[PDB]
């Protein structure tokens, strides 16, 4: 009858609503405190350190995110108990925070890339953006690119794959196009660093262009859009990973050209003006 009735939890619930908190926030916190209490077999306001530690370690096979969230709800509960004068101690002081979960940044969207392609900019800025977003190049790969790395007749380029093993990538038509406006032999981005610009200024350029385009993210996020947008266009996971030179593949699987035609047909589907990507697929191209 009274089992599982936790009058003090309901007091906290009412208090939280009066702080203008939402039902979503409050009911999730209350459910967590009740879950811990029922599993431990204790009234939630009297739970002791070792019970809470046991529940956070053994009450479920929690993900890192779930454990982090649960720790925060328990911290809010016990801090409230102490602050309101209901309990002298706070057992969470004795419990180290769990592993901070990976913060999932905002993925760059097709509309973001549209605006990035539309910002007025020097052609070297446009080239850096195109290499990141439409070839998946990392900023140090962009910085060192030379005209003599590109075959515009065969529409290919050479870049480092895994380790020291060279890879041959098909060129997106947008990159072929800007390549004919760039040096056909020397560095695209001349600078003091082995003849080219520093990777830091390539990163800084892409970052400033994204701010100007109203886009949050970085050059890395454009390489992630490259993979994400390829998957959204129907390209199969393995081909995307080859086009990205993803390190889950071996240098041989990356540098092989048995799949040249699938790769070339895949990369050409990339169109920010345009097939269902899941949390599982996205983890396949993550880095």
Under the rule (CB under 5 A), what is the footprint of Na ion?
Answer: 79-80, 83
| Alpha carbons 237 and 239: distance in angstroms, whole number | 6
- Compute the distance between CA of residue 283 and CA of residue 224 in angstroms, rounded to an integer: 11
Give least dist CB 93 to Na ion, A. 14
Among residues 10 and 83, whose Cβ is nearest to Na ion? Answer: 83
| Cα 283-286-287 angle, rounded to 5 deg | 145
- Residue 210: name the closest of 280, 286, 71, 109 by CA: 109
Whole-angstrom Cα distance, residue 143 to residue 188? 8
Q: Tally DSSP H helices, then E strands, for the chain.
A: 14, 5
| Of 15 and 46, CB closest to Na ion | 15
DSSP state of 245: T
Cα separation, 79 vs 85, whole angstroms: 10
Q: Which is nearer to Na ion, 55 or 78 (CB)?
A: 78
Q: Looking at beta carbons only, is 19 or 61 nearer to Na ion?
A: 19
Least distance in angstroms from the C-beta of 149 to Na ion: 59
Closest distance to Na ion from the beta carbon of 35 (Å): 20
As measured in angstroms, the least distance from the Cβ of 80 to Na ion is 4
CB nearer Na ion, residue 21 or residue 95: 21
CB of 79 to Na ion, least distance (A): 5
């Amino acid at each position: 009858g009274f089992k599982g009735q936790y009058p003090m939890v309901n007091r906290w619930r009412t208090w939280q609503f009066a702080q203008s908190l939402s039902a979503r926030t409050v009911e999730e916190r209350v459910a967590t405190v009740r879950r811990m209490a029922a599993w431990c077999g204790v009234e939630p306001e009297f739970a002791q350190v070792e019970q809470i530690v046991s529940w956070l370690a053994e009450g479920g096979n929690w993900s890192a995110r779930t454990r982090w969230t649960y720790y925060g709800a328990l911290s809010a509960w016990f801090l409230w108990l102490q602050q309101q004068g209901h309990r002298h101690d706070n057992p969470m002081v004795m419990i180290g925070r769990p592993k901070r979960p990976k913060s999932v940044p905002r993925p760059v969207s097709n509309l973001d890339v549209q605006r990035l392609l539309a910002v007025r900019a020097h052609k070297r800025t446009k080239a850096m953006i195109l290499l990141a977003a439409f070839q998946g190049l990392r900023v140090h790969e962009i910085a060192q690119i030379k005209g003599e790395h590109l075959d515009l007749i065969e529409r290919t380029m050479t870049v480092t794959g895994k380790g020291n093993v060279t890879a041959t990538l098909p060129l997106h038509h947008r990159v072929v196009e800007i390549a004919y406006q760039m040096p056909r032999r020397g560095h695209w981005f001349p600078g003091p660093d082995r003849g080219h610009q520093r990777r830091e200024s390539v990163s800084g350029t892409i970052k400033e262009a994204m701010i100007r385009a109203g886009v949050v993210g970085s050059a890395h996020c454009l390489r992630h859009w490259f993979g994400t947008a390829l998957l959204e266009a129907g390209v199969d996971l393995r081909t995307v990973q080859e086009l990205m030179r993803h390190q889950s593949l071996t240098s041989t699987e990356i540098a092989t050209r048995v799949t040249d035609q699938r790769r070339a047909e895949g990369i050409e589907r990339l169109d920010p003006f345009r097939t269902r990507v899941t949390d599982r697929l996205l983890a396949q191209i993550a880095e």
